[PDB]
Enzyme design. Structure first.
Site, short mmCIF file in Angstrom:
data_model
loop_
_atom_site.label_atom_id
_atom_site.label_comp_id
_atom_site.label_asym_id
_atom_site.label_seq_id
_atom_site.Cartn_x
_atom_site.Cartn_y
_atom_site.Cartn_z
N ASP A 240 -9.48 -17.82 17.91
CA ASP A 240 -8.86 -17.39 19.17
C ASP A 240 -8.79 -15.86 19.28
O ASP A 240 -8.96 -15.30 20.36
CB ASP A 240 -7.44 -17.96 19.31
N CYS B 33 -20.00 -18.31 27.14
CA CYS B 33 -18.66 -18.37 26.55
C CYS B 33 -17.69 -18.38 27.74
O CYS B 33 -17.94 -19.10 28.71
CB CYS B 33 -18.48 -17.24 25.54
N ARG C 144 -19.17 -13.15 22.94
CA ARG C 144 -19.83 -14.08 22.02
C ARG C 144 -21.28 -14.38 22.43
O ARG C 144 -22.18 -14.47 21.57
CB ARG C 144 -19.04 -15.39 21.94
N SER C 145 -21.51 -14.57 23.73
CA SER C 145 -22.87 -14.85 24.22
C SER C 145 -23.83 -13.71 23.88
O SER C 145 -25.00 -13.95 23.53
CB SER C 145 -22.83 -15.06 25.74
N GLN D 249 -18.31 -7.05 23.55
CA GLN D 249 -17.09 -6.62 24.25
C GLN D 249 -16.16 -5.74 23.41
O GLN D 249 -15.26 -5.11 23.99
CB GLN D 249 -16.27 -7.84 24.69
#
Ligand code: JP4
Length: 282
Positions: free
Chosen positions: A181, A215, A221-222, A262
């Site tokens: 998370d 994502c 994440r992508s 990110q």
């Protein structure tokens, strides 16, 4: 510089935030006028994450052709990817329309439906064989065929039917279920194992349309997934694998979608994944 020793040099000097901010400063800026039209407000999950006009995927529809999705085309590596946001309640039909029209074999999902107590994307695939889904706005039917649950990821076989023509196709759903998370994984080993399973399926290969990867926003994440895949492929293709420059590859990918990677922690994790992955390949 090479990668593994550039890596230790940034760790020892603690300058990951400065490296990452340089990338943000040099990244491309292209218009995203279609994304910002008022009629498309409920087609975007986040107001600050939009596809560029020049690389956006168009739906084959005359009313409204918009979806928050981008084509990342890597010329030297000879790989293409579609990066998109997690589908919204009012875009699940558009999502499967795109999969159909672009002739994709695989869908890669890097998030859970709920994280941090909030919904990160719609439940857009069926959970039981006998309870199929019909998307009336785009005239598609989706059936769960089989499911294989492993410790870090789940693979599903799905049948997508175009109800207008009665054509059917098999779609593979690759779901990485264990990204934490907060932060990034401590070791890249399970993420690399997952990438290799997607590769082995044929979903990334030229005989199919581009893989669809998402994502929640389709950039973090992508971005890590496609950056690692492309860097490892280039290290196999070139005479000098130490010439592969992960910062340069990331800036090339950011010509096609804004914001890929990110955080500075995601940048460090991408380096780690490529470094460890290059040892296993040989
Ligand atoms: O019952 C689920 C369903 C079936 C068919 C078409 C759409 C949906 N929904 C839309 C809202 O988001 C969850 C999927």
């Amino acid at each position: 510089m090479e990668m593994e020793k550039e890596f230790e040099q940034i760790d020892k000097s603690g300058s990951w935030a400065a490296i990452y901010q340089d990338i943000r400063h040099e990244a491309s800026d292209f218009p995203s006028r279609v994304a910002k039209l008022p009629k498309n407000k409920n087609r975007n999950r986040y107001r600050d994450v939009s596809p560029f006009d020049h690389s956006r995927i168009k739906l084959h529809q005359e009313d409204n052709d918009y979806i928050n999705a981008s084509l990342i085309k890597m010329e030297e590596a000879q790989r293409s990817y579609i990066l998109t946001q997690g589908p919204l309640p009012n875009t699940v039909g558009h999502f499967w329309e795109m999969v159909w029209e672009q002739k994709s074999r695989g869908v890669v999902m890097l998030n859970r439906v709920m994280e941090k107590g909030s919904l990160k994307c719609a439940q857009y695939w069926p959970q039981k064989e006998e309870k199929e889904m019909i998307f009336e706005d785009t005239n598609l039917k989706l059936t769960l065929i089989s499911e294989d649950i492993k410790s870090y990821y789940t693979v599903r076989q799905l049948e997508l039917e175009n109800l207008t023509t009665q054509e059917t196709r098999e779609i593979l759903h690759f779901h990485y279920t264990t990204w934490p998370d907060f932060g990034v994984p401590e070791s890249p080993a399970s993420f690399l194992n997952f990438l290799f399973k997607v590769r082995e399926s044929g979903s990334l290969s030229p005989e199919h349309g581009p893989v669809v990867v998402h994502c929640s926003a389709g950039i973090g994440r992508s971005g890590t997934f496609c950056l690692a895949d492309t860097c490892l492929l280039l290290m196999d293709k070139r005479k000098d694998p130490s010439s592969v420059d992960i910062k340069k590859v990331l800036l090339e990918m950011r010509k096609f979608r804004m914001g890929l990677i990110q955080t500075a922690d995601q940048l460090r994790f991408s380096y780690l994944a490529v470094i460890e992955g290059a040892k296993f390949i040989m």
